[PDB]
Scaffold this motif. Structure first.
Motif, PDB file in Angstrom:
ATOM      1  N   UNK A 132      17.305  -7.964 -51.425  1.00 22.32           N
ATOM      2  CA  UNK A 132      17.880  -8.877 -50.442  1.00 22.32           C
ATOM      3  C   UNK A 132      19.400  -8.819 -50.444  1.00 22.32           C
ATOM      4  N   UNK A 133      20.004  -8.811 -51.633  1.00 21.35           N
ATOM      5  CA  UNK A 133      21.456  -8.775 -51.717  1.00 21.35           C
ATOM      6  C   UNK A 133      22.041  -7.483 -51.183  1.00 21.35           C
ATOM      7  N   UNK A 134      21.485  -6.349 -51.599  1.00 19.45           N
ATOM      8  CA  UNK A 134      22.064  -5.074 -51.200  1.00 19.45           C
ATOM      9  C   UNK A 134      21.912  -4.842 -49.703  1.00 19.45           C
ATOM     10  N   UNK A 168      21.425  -7.309 -47.290  1.00 20.57           N
ATOM     11  CA  UNK A 168      22.236  -8.288 -46.592  1.00 20.57           C
ATOM     12  C   UNK A 168      23.710  -7.946 -46.632  1.00 20.57           C
ATOM     13  N   UNK A 169      24.177  -7.421 -47.762  1.00 27.85           N
ATOM     14  CA  UNK A 169      25.582  -7.065 -47.901  1.00 27.85           C
ATOM     15  C   UNK A 169      25.945  -5.802 -47.143  1.00 27.85           C
ATOM     16  N   UNK A 212      14.936 -10.125 -54.851  1.00 29.52           N
ATOM     17  CA  UNK A 212      16.233 -10.761 -54.652  1.00 29.52           C
ATOM     18  C   UNK A 212      17.351  -9.738 -54.685  1.00 29.52           C
ATOM     19  N   UNK A 213      17.256  -8.759 -55.582  1.00 27.23           N
ATOM     20  CA  UNK A 213      18.263  -7.704 -55.636  1.00 27.23           C
ATOM     21  C   UNK A 213      18.288  -6.904 -54.342  1.00 27.23           C
TER      22      UNK A 213
END
Ligand SMILES: [Cl-]
Ligand SMILES: [Cl-]
Ligand SMILES: [Cl-]
Ligand SMILES: [K+]
Ligand SMILES: [K+]
Ligand SMILES: [K+]
Ligand SMILES: [K+]
Ligand SMILES: [K+]
Ligand code: NA
Ligand SMILES: [Zn+2]
Ligand SMILES: [Zn+2]
Lengths: 392, 347, 128, 347, 389, 128
Positions: free
Chosen positions: B123-125, B127-128, B120-121
């Protein structure tokens, strides 16, 4: 450039000497050498000491100051020389070069080792290997020489029986030596069936951990005459040294010690003799295979044939047509006190060539009057050769 | 827009059968095999630990991704058995794959959900747009308390996932993620103690199933899906029985859950459990396959994922060892050698 | 502690040096080329972990730390690029022979007691 | 695009002066104060730990954000002193602030950079749209080995940051972040041992300064900035000396680095150190102020941040206790009571 | 018995060199020495290395083989010589005697030390003391020299201010040295108020733990003209060595180092000069007091007066110049290399090399002397150099 | 470990040697008399533990093991019989001076970590 000779030799017993302290040891050897040479303590102009362990066995560095202090010879200069198992021979060569220079006339060259005081000796003996690239990965010192035996067996077809015969001879010779660590007869089966240390080596192929000290008195060839009779003086025709890669994996060919070939060839050249003229030889046989390899590198037989020579026993004292190797029993049977071995090797040639009563029961035949010694540091990174003769 | 560009797995070669543990402690092995749905488990070599296992998995994932590790902007390692108490595994892994120095890293802890927390981490970095690629690893060399039932399942293994932004490079695509978390004292370990403690049957319904089923129900509600929309599924697998109970409760069939279940022959690899199960699904899945992945960690929480497989999968599966091949290359050992390897003998 | 950090890229990733002047690859990396010495120009070079057994031994009585591994195989591996290294081999003692192709693997080499630093590095695994 | 919507801090009330430790161990206190640039440190009450400190800081950040904690979609706690070896602090904190159950969480480990690693994770999750708000905490109850120099600096504290997407709610904005990470054995602890070990003088130039300065230069290159572009700065502060050396090396003046330096009266709170220093800057900063924040962790690694303050800062500063107020509400104790509280007495 | 000269000298920086390995250090020094001497690698006939630490710093013994191997000079003979902090000078003396003997013509004498790799260096530096009868009971190496300082103060009335001026001067001198570990000026108050290590010594009296390497190329005086201009050749007039009790408590007098008196006297005789003729001296000042004692034992001033002659700072035109480089305290003390560095400074000073341009002493007579001490005095090696053969 | 065992009689009981030839008492015991060397004949000799401070120092930053003792007094004691020894003094920092009469005491000198052996030996105590 003065000629250098040997006027005296002294030695302690090699073995597990619990009673005798490291200090107590070097003294006993020094006094014996002083007595043998017929010199006083004041006559010594300098000392050169070999010790590999130094701070690993006892935590003590600066052993030179310690030894000179406790021998009572202050303020004579004392110097420690180190090259792992070759520290002894390097101490001698340093002593020889100091006499040849004219700065000292009488010099003591000695070596001492007290390996019993450490719980595990392995770590110290492994110091002679590359710590970062051999020891770090778990290559013990016996395992390095075992990998040499493996490659030598692969290339030249040496069989374990042929290798094991080296150990049988060594122990037989050691029964004739009072100062030897092991004074017992063995057999091929006992050697081969002994507990294994590192394939293909067994406990009966490996030299043991030893305490001991030995010392030589070296002197200017001309001054030698005032302390000793012209008989019983032995002359140092050559004192040579060479280097090789410290790590076995960096060797161009691991079945030979280039530094020995380089050093021995240089010695033969300076002495103006060929390998065929050597009557007795002392080689570094800490793991047997090393004995076979040096017999080849010194030029006594062709590469790969050492095994054939050992099986027939040509190196034996009793055998007359060939050079006599390790009459004292070598490192395996007589003992291997790292720092003193290089000195002891030479002390045996001194006795053998001077027909001293110390080696009377192991006296080799002397057709020509020459002896050579090969002392190896670690797996071959350092080799020092000394060529002696009864003639100047 | 966010997907998996590469993945990799590792399992050590040694195994130990239930019979060898039960023999020693005086228990019926068949009762255990049937009760837990476990036959054998994995055992790491004494020169293996979470760091080495993570490096193996990471390196395999790089092969499948086919990218330059220098491009990885984050490395996260989730575990319960980091070789050090204070020194990050993730840094050693980054150095060992050549991702250093232009990256961030962290070691993750959350019982057996640590590994999926890192996904998930990443995914965030990604995607951002803060990084181009991130790596999430889940690995463990679990140790069960001698004599306890966890000794039959506590195994070693790990899997790595590299997250990226580029459709052409994605082997799978994240459709969504969801997490359920509470404070639940079902399983814990204190800093001094060698082995964990637990609440026995409190570990079941109020913890594992509560969180696994709420998380699974949660992502399907978020995504507008039913069990019928998914081709494959994988849940946390502390034993085979919990996995199957959960899978059947939600309505998944054997064909849907079969690939994700590795514990019966691998054991419970803790933070590597679901990552490894997911990886076996990916070794078998075909284009368009939709996967439900739900992890569990004690404390407690679960991470749910909804993933769809792309056409690129067949290009990479053979670029590294398959999880079934690793699992089947094995050497059996007895209990004496096992406790020797695992450091379970007081010395 | 500091010594491990200096050789991490060599032990972890098998990164050595190539002398441009003569082309010989060196591993472990060398500060000076022995053949060209001062005229040698060294570049960074990444080795593949592939090689073959050149020689080996089986250590039956090692120091106490290795008690779990005993008896273990130690070998000198000839890497494909040229250099030779000393390392352990992860195989049974009856499966090692000269010429066996092997491959480097990141493994736990040593540990400085219970309080000290863990040291990682290469160990070789046979490949079928 | 991404910013801080709220932040909060906590420091316990007990302190101990260098004089009181040196008195016991027979050292010159003036030499230590000058050598380390440290006067005293914080001490947690025996009923306080990283979880409680994390909760205090988290609750204060919620006050400043002025939001409903139910909306927080991730909680990350970075620490070295998680009260459990295996049970997540982050879960306890989420339960204690009412963020549960619709969120993910994880406990973070990476020496003293764990806290800032979590900030980057939240930035990613918020920027990618995977969550609406994320919380990153850095907190510790450090323990220095009796008799060692770390006992003069090892203190307790923590700070929390809530990350958000809504310009109206942002008190500060992230302009960019960058991280430098390698494998460096400067500082570590093994699972069995009570206190860490370290490489002494190796902890400095090759580790702290290498990473802190490479991380700083790196983000300034990424941002195209110079030291002059920044109004305030904060670096890792294991002692005052390292901080000031780093700050002066990069060209920062006292006015720029003064607010971020708390160690001389707080001690080194490890993963809470930079988070706390940053919070003191924010308690003083004005609209438009630009901040450089660079953490350090042994391992090793550093997280750099480039932040700009907005006009909302002055609406929220007084909505919770100010870091300086917490730091000055203090009660002094001697070494005997200190070791009693900290559990440093054998039994 | 040939005359021996110096044709080249090379040195690394002295300090905390984390990136530079033990190998990287000795090479850098050797290549610098080779390059300065204008010799090829093949022209080296033998090497002599000093390294006290060896296997206590890294666990590596057999350093000679390692250094020759990685320098690329195999199969040249390489030999390690050890006498604690005097190993450097001892390697030089060994090299000198080998050239004098005729067995080697061009020989490298170098020293190297890697003390930063160990967590605690004290145990190694304490190796130079008696382990059984000094270290065992808790006498740290600084505490031994402190007891010398206390006894010297008791007998001769040296005050802490006089002793502390030695350190002020050293640090001022070290700012002119590129290779010095410490390049900052200090004051009497900063020295006296520094943290104490062992009464009466402070951290600003004690030399630091240092990494570094230095190397000399020594050569036969006649062949030297083949590689170097007759201008840049420095001749070794004397290379002497002596012995004393290893333990301080066994000394006849603790305020003097008999081995230094013995060695220096012998050097002065062979060179046929007096102490009044020395222009520059490099002494072993690991703890300041040792610098004062050696200034007396070499014959530059009366026993007990060293404190008074140093307080005046005798820039000073009519007195010998001591430790122009900063000495061991300020320039750094890499145990094995110090004895080499000491001589390399005299070589630079006597040949008016650019390297010591900013710290150049006046040379009325063209003589320099170096005193290198092992431990508390158990070994002393002296080297006397001149610009004239 | 073995080296402590050899010197137990010296460290515990201060038993040195006296050379008959010149009469000089030696402690620690010596294998050879430095003044007479061979012609010295050494005999066992029991020293009284009494002596005076010859010189001293105060160790402010010793190795970690001594953390409980720090700061401690180290001295060289001149024993009444003649020999000098290096040893610690159990007195307060501001009470040590040259010439102070002292007396040996059996004390715990060092310990080889948590697992290793304890070594006892002499420490000196002032009189009145
Ligand atoms: Cl005599
Ligand atoms: Cl956890
Ligand atoms: Cl060259
Ligand atoms: K051969
Ligand atoms: K942990
Ligand atoms: K990168
Ligand atoms: K965005
Ligand atoms: K020049
Ligand atoms: Na024969
Ligand atoms: Zn080349
Ligand atoms: Zn006498």
């Amino acid at each position: 450039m003065r000629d250098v000779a040997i006027i005296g030799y002294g030695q302690t017993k090699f073995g597990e000497l619990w009673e005798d302290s490291f200090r107590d040891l070097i003294v006993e050897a020094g006094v014996k050498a002083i007595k043998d040479a017929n010199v006083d303590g004041g006559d010594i102009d300098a000392m050169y000491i070999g010790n590999m362990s130094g701070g690993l066995f006892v935590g003590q560095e600066h052993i030179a100051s310690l030894i000179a202090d406790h021998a009572g010879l202050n303020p004579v200069p004392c110097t420690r020389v180190e090259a792992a198992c070759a520290s002894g021979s390097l101490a001698l060569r340093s002593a020889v070069l100091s006499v040849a220079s004219g700065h000292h006339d009488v010099v003591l060259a000695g070596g001492v080792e007290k390996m019993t005081d450490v719980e595990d000796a392995t770590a110290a003996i492994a110091s002679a290997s590359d710590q970062e690239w051999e020891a770090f990965f778990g290559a013990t010192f016996p395992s390095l020489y075992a990998m040499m035996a493996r490659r030598y067996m692969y290339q030249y077809g040496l069989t374990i029986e042929e290798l094991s015969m080296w150990s049988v001879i060594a122990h037989e010779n050691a029964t004739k030596n009072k100062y030897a660590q092991f004074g017992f007869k063995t057999t091929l089966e006992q050697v081969m069936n002994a507990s294994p240390v590192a394939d293909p080596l067994t406990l009966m192929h490996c030299s043991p951990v030893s305490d001991g000290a030995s010392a030589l008195i070296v002197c200017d060839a001309d001054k030698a005459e005032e302390f000793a009779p012209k008989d019983e003086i032995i002359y140092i025709k050559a004192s040579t040294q060479a280097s090789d890669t410290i790590a076995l994996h960096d060797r161009e060919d691991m079945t030979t010690l280039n530094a020995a070939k380089v050093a021995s060839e240089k010695a033969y050249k300076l002495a103006k003799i060929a390998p065929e003229k050597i009557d007795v030889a002392e080689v570094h046989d800490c793991f047997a295979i090393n004995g076979l390899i040096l017999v080849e590198d010194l030029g006594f037989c062709k590469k790969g044939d050492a095994g054939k020579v050992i099986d027939e026993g040509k190196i034996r004292i009793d055998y007359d047509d060939f050079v006599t190797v390790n009459p004292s029993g070598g490192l395996k049977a007589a003992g291997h006190a790292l720092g003193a071995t290089g000195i002891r090797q030479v002390g045996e040639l001194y006795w053998q060539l001077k027909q001293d009563k110390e080696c009377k029961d192991r006296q080799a035949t002397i057709k020509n009057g020459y002896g050579i010694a090969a002392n190896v540091g670690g797996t071959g990174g350092t080799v020092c050769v000394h060529l002696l003769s009864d003639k100047r | 827009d966010i997907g998996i560009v590469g993945y990799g797995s590792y399992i050590p070669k040694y195994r130990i059968k239930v019979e060898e543990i039960a023999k020693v402690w005086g228990k019926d092995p068949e009762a255990i095999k049937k009760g837990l749905v476990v036959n054998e488990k994995s055992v790491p070599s004494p020169d293996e630990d979470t760091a080495t296992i993570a490096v193996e998995a990471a390196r395999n994932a790089v092969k499948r991704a086919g990218i330059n590790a220098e491009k990885i902007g984050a490395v996260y390692v989730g575990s319960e058995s980091h070789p050090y108490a204070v020194k990050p595994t993730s840094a050693t892994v980054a150095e060992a794959i050549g991702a250093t120095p232009d990256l961030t890293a962290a070691d993750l802890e959350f019982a057996c959900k640590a590994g999926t927390a890192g996904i998930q981490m990443c995914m965030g970095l990604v995607g951002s747009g803060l990084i181009e690629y991130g790596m999430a690893i889940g690995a463990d060399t679990a140790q069960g308390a001698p004599g306890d039932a966890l000794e039959y399942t506590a195994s070693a293994g790990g899997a790595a996932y590299i997250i990226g932004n580029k459709k052409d490079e994605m082997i799978a695509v994240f459709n969504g993620t969801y997490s359920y978390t509470t404070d639940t004292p079902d399983f814990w370990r204190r800093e001094g103690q060698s082995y964990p403690k637990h609440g026995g049957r409190f570990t079941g319904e109020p913890a594992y199933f509560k969180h696994v089923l709420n998380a699974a129900k949660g992502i399907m509600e978020k995504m507008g899906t039913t069990v019928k929309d998914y081709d494959y599924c994988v849940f946390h697998q502390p034993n085979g029985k919990f996995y199957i109970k959960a899978a059947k409760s939600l309505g998944f069939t054997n064909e849907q859950y079969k690939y994700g279940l590795l514990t019966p022959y691998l054991g419970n690899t803790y933070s590597g459990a679901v990552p490894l199960g997911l990886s076996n699904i990916l070794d078998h899945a075909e284009e368009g396959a939709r996967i439900l992945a739900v992890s569990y960690g004690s404390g407690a929480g679960s991470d749910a994922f909804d993933i769809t497989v792309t056409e690129r999968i067949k290009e990479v599966v053979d670029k590294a060892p398959k999880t079934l091949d690793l699992l089947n290359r094995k050497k059996y050992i007895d209990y004496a050698v096992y406790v020797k390897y695992r450091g379970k003998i007081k010395i | 502690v500091v010594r491990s950090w200096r050789h991490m890229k060599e032990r972890y990733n098998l990164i050595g040096t190539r002398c441009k002047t003569c082309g010989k690859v060196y591993f472990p990396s060398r500060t000076v080329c022995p053949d060209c010495r001062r005229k040698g120009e060294l570049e960074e070079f990444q080795l593949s972990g592939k090689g073959k057994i050149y020689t080996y031994s089986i250590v039956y009585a090692p120091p106490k730390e290795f008690n779990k591994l005993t008896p273990y195989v130690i070998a000198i591996v000839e890497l494909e690029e040229g250099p030779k290294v000393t390392a352990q081999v992860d195989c049974d003692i009856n499966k090692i022979s000269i010429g066996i192709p092997v491959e480097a693997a990141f493994r736990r080499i040593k540990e400085d007691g219970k309080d000290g630093i863990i040291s990682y590095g290469y160990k070789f695994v046979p490949i079928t």
